[PDB]
Design a protein around this ligand. Structure first.
Ligand SMILES: C[NH+](C)c1cc(NC(=O)CNC(C)(C)C)c(O)c2c1C[C@H]1C[C@H]3[C@H]([NH+](C)C)C(O)=C(C(N)=O)C(=O)[C@@]3(O)C(O)=C1C2=O
Ligand SMILES: [Mg+2]
Ligand SMILES: [Mg+2]
Ligand SMILES: [Mg+2]
Ligand SMILES: [Mg+2]
Ligand SMILES: [Mg+2]
Ligand SMILES: [Mg+2]
Ligand SMILES: [Mg+2]
Ligand SMILES: [Mg+2]
Ligand SMILES: [Mg+2]
Ligand SMILES: [Mg+2]
Ligand SMILES: [Mg+2]
Ligand SMILES: [Mg+2]
Ligand SMILES: [Mg+2]
Ligand SMILES: [Mg+2]
Ligand SMILES: [Mg+2]
Ligand SMILES: [Mg+2]
Ligand SMILES: [Mg+2]
Ligand SMILES: [Mg+2]
Ligand SMILES: [Mg+2]
Ligand SMILES: [Mg+2]
Ligand SMILES: [Mg+2]
Ligand SMILES: [Mg+2]
Ligand SMILES: [Mg+2]
Ligand SMILES: [Mg+2]
Ligand SMILES: [Mg+2]
Ligand SMILES: [Mg+2]
Ligand SMILES: [Zn+2]
Lengths: 99, 206, 24, 83, 127, 60
RNA sequence: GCAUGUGGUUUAAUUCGAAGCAACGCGAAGAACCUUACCAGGCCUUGACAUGCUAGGGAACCCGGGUGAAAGCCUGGGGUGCCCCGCGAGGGGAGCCCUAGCACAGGUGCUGCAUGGCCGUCGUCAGCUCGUGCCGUGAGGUGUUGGGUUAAGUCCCGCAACGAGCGCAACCCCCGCCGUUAGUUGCCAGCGGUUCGGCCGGGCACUCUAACGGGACUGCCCGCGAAAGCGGGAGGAAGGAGGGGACGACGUCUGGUCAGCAUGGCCCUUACGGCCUGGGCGACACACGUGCUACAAUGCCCACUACAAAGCGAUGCCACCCGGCAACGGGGAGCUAAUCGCAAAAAGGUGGGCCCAGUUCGGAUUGGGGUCUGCAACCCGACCCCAUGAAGCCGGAAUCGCUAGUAAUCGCGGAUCAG
């Protein structure tokens, strides 16, 4: 029924964040298809270590978009409020779908 | 110029980012631009308070500016008088929900950037170059750190011949990832010029 | 050719499409 | 070259000095800094000074120098040799 | 009845199904040749089968995705390989010191910075 | 960074073609990532303090 | 031959710096104006920018004309909020606005040989040192050396040494096997239906998908050896560090840049500072440095036919539809992106055309015709179609790279950025 999409930066909070959520959609009246690991995306930046001329010496950075997605089957009115009284991870961005 | 920055190594290995958000392609560009104003004003002023590590966690247009600092009552004033002057001067720059806290630097020798500063100060202060750096380190294995090291690095003492100096002690092992070490870049200013300074401290293997 | 424009691979090389490289 | 789906191109301030001195059956030397513009058949027989860096250059406009832009008749640099 | 093996090699993955019967091979629907045409390493994929006497003993249902047909054929082969220990955990004796049970741990190394293609560097006269 | 030349790129221009970015942090528009509004010198310099979230140091 | 830097010349200027390897497709991960420091013109003077001071007027502000290459300047009008006092006209105030003056702003002016920082490098080479002691009157030595071993100062044995600090190494990531949690937008082995398309029911088996763990230790065996180690094998997905990455010790070259930024100092501040349109970094008797495509039969070409990984995209990616030989234009469905799209992978495969030719090789340089981005393609762009079809039949002396999924060869992608 109601689907969530977590898009963050860690692999830590993003797993933590989504496993607090995964407990109060079991106790509160819902069967659930578990925590879902998704097609992470990488944006990398290759850059000249040097101020000036020394080109062929280069540094490497990767910004890792981490995608999580959990499905709630049978969403109660014992539920929906239990997950707006669970909200607490800091670097995460949550979103809420429903078809 | 051969080696690498210690912090920027343990990026989520034995350290952590100061600004800890999320962001889209639209937002990250502007959103961050903001933090570098937040951290330009915040710094420029708070100097003689001894400011250390500046967190800026973020939710839906709620900024969360924490602040570690040597001396929490030069951030404060008397009562709660001067902290308010700023707490809005930031929402004056953001245009939103500045939650500007305070957190004391408990032990001050056991946090690098401070250590760096007081020395870079002491150089601005026209002190004994060597002894500055010796006692610098001294206090660090006196407060109880695993390793110490300070790198004075200018035209030193007023000389026309640019050199460099230093000393240290204990474990300094920056090739062990699993060793937590804090870097302190300072940057004294004296009549003859500008004399960057460094300071590394080991606390422990994890 | 490959530096040749009016051909099979020579388009592909440039990246382009033309009468000599279709869109199916 | 220039899209036909979007017709020819000329700068306004320059065309202004042309079809006012056309509409008064006179001819004078014009001084403008556009080169970026396409000469048109309603300028033929005009004395037009175009600029290269420092100098306004003598370019009296005849017939079959039609659709070519202005800057083709006003060399930009100086090359005679190396010694 | 079906015996299955896990076949993998160099950014290409292959799935094997061993039923008792003929020696027809369907790889993504198509016959063994209508997918591995004028290509010679082709018929080599079956090697791990013929060192125990069974080409004509079993059928072959196949699926592959990724890599090129060589890197698939190595995986196909490594699939018929693994597949035979699920039938005979005694065939293991015959096809290891014969070498057919191993992930070719070989891999297209990373392109490096400063080096045209990882290992290759730039030419320079006037040294 | 000629001071006034951060400003010839701050304000909006005569025509939209002249829209070249620059660094917020130093004013070198020579190699700038329109995702950081920053250049390569900066991006490291900063990334080396962890002041850009999620910006890890890469390796594979 | 063309592409790109560079030397030298030329130039109103062709702005700067890089200098044997370790400058030369390097600062430029995007010079038509912009960038832009350069040159020629038209200009601005508390200045495009800061925190202000004093005198006098002004709410801020917003609309139009004139002259003009644009800037710039002369000028018409709309507007008269906020704070305090007051019944009131209206004075005082904060902001900001203009004129004059002053603080001063600003400079990609100089010096990298006055610095910061960061980079290159000898060099991922196995080295560099200190403590206490020992030994010399001492500088100093010993340790670290010798023999064995190691990718190593790795380690074993010896020694007047014993240990530690910075290096080696491990802890981090990638790839290789496998297990735990997981079944969407991915997946289809069995069963049901099937518009034959994993299309639908159903399932999450396996592939994949990211997070955490397991596993390799000279452990086992014969041999060699005081030992460390070494050689061959058994098991294992992996064997002696399994492959790859990040990771650069005390120091040197007064190596690099005041041109990202930072700053001592010398230097201008109605001018090097500032704004502007145009011109220039692309000029061309040459020379080097880097690469692209060739000179072709293991090939060129036209069809039909398969198999990828990685990344980007709601100010964009653009399935199809129509027009055009085509670039592309018009219309328009989907996609915050495992769901939609760039997307054609290409060498390979099937089938056929060429038959040693300056050639159906080769694809320069030209003539003309168009499309697109853009205020604007003459300097000075890319792409389409037609016609032009140059040099070159594998390259002097010299010289470069690579030890395995490497070298070669073939395609895809991203950053920068309208193009
Ligand atoms: C010419 N000499 C007298 C010189 C002078 C100065 N500086 C001064 O004279 C400035 N003195 C003041 C303080 C202004 C009075 C100098 O500053 C220098 C040099 C030497 C150069 C040599 C350079 C050389 N190459 C690249 C041209 C070179 O091969 C090396 C090298 N060792 O590889 C260099 O070191 C060199 O680049 C260099 O650094 C020099 C100077 O710095
Ligand atoms: Mg041809
Ligand atoms: Mg390859
Ligand atoms: Mg190179
Ligand atoms: Mg400056
Ligand atoms: Mg631009
Ligand atoms: Mg200079
Ligand atoms: Mg220009
Ligand atoms: Mg130097
Ligand atoms: Mg120099
Ligand atoms: Mg020098
Ligand atoms: Mg080594
Ligand atoms: Mg003695
Ligand atoms: Mg010993
Ligand atoms: Mg030694
Ligand atoms: Mg000795
Ligand atoms: Mg050791
Ligand atoms: Mg389903
Ligand atoms: Mg069926
Ligand atoms: Mg290491
Ligand atoms: Mg040199
Ligand atoms: Mg250039
Ligand atoms: Mg059509
Ligand atoms: Mg179209
Ligand atoms: Mg021939
Ligand atoms: Mg080798
Ligand atoms: Mg490409
Ligand atoms: Zn920058």
């Amino acid at each position: 029924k109601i689907r969530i999409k977590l898009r963050g930066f860690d692999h830590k909070t993003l797993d933590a964040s989504a496993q607090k959520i995964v407990e109060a959609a079991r106790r509160s009246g819902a069967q659930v298809s578990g925590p879902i690991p998704l097609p992470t995306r990488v944006r990398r930046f290759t850059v000249i270590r040097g101020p000036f001329k020394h080109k062929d010496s280069r540094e490497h950075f990767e910004l890792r978009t981490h995608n999580r997605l959990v499905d709630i089957i049978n969403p109660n009115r014992k539920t929906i409020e239990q997950l707006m009284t669970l909200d607490l991870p800091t670097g995460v961005e949550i979103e809420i779908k429903t078809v | 110029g051969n080696k690498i920055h210690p912090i920027g190594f343990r990026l989520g290995i034995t350290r952590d980012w100061e600004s800890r958000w999320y962001a889209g392609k639209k937002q990250y560009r502007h959103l961050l631009l903001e933090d570098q104003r937040i951290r330009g004003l915040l710094e420029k002023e708070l100097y003689s308070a001894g400011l250390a590590r500046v967190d800026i966690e973020r939710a839906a247009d709620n900024v969360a500016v924490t602040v570690h600092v040597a001396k929490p009552g030069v951030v404060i004033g008397r009562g709660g008088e001067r902290i308010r002057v700023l707490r809005e001067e930031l929402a004056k720059l953001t245009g939103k929900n500045v939650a500007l806290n305070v957190q004391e630097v408990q032990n001050p020798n056991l946090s690098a950037p401070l250590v760096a500063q007081r020395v870079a100060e002491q150089i601005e202060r026209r002190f004994a170059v060597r002894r500055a750096i010796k006692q610098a380190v001294q206090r660090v294995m006196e407060s109880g750190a695993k390793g110490a090291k300070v790198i004075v690095s200018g035209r030193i003492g007023g000389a026309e011949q640019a050199r460099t100096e230093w000393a240290a002690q204990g474990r300094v092992p920056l090739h062990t990832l699993r060793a937590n070490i804090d870097y302190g870049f300072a940057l004294a200013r004296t009549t003859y010029g500008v004399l960057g300074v460094k300071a590394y401290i080991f606390l422990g293997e994890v | 050719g490959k530096g040749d424009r009016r051909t099979r691979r020579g388009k592909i090389w440039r990246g382009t499409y033309g009468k000599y490289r279709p869109r199916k | 070259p220039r899209s036909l789906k979007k017709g020819v191109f000329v700068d306004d301030h320059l065309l202004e000095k042309v079809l006012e001195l056309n509409a008064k059956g006179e001819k004078r030397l014009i001084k403008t800094w556009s080169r970026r513009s396409t000469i048109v058949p309603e300028m033929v027989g005009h004395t037009i000074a175009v600029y290269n860096g420092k100098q306004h250059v003598p370019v009296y406009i005849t017939e079959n120098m039609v659709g070519h832009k202005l800057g083709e008749f006003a060399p930009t640099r100086t090359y005679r040799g190396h010694g | 009845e079906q015996y299955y093996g896990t076949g993998r090699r160099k950014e290409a993955v292959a799935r094997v199904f061993l039923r008792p019967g003929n020696g027809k091979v369907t790889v993504n629907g198509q016959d063994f040749n209508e997918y591995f045409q004028g290509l010679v390493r082709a018929v080599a994929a079956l090697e791990p089968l013929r060192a125990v006497d069974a080409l004509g003993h079993f059928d072959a249902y196949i699926t592959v995705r990724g890599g090129g047909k060589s890197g698939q054929i190595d995986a196909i082969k490594l699939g018929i390989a693994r597949a035979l220990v699920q039938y005979n955990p005694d065939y293991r004796a015959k096809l290891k010191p014969l070498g057919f049970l191993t992930r070719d741990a070989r891999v297209v190394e990373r392109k490096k910075y400063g080096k045209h293609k990882a290992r290759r560097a730039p030419q320079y006269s006037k040294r | 960074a000629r001071k006034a030349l951060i400003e010839k790129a701050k304000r909006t221009p005569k025509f939209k073609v002249r829209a070249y970015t620059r660094c917020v942090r130093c004013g070198r528009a020579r190699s700038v990532y329109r995702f950081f509004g920053l250049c390569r010198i900066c991006l490291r310099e900063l990334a080396h303090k962890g002041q850009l979230p999620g910006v890890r140091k890469a390796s594979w």
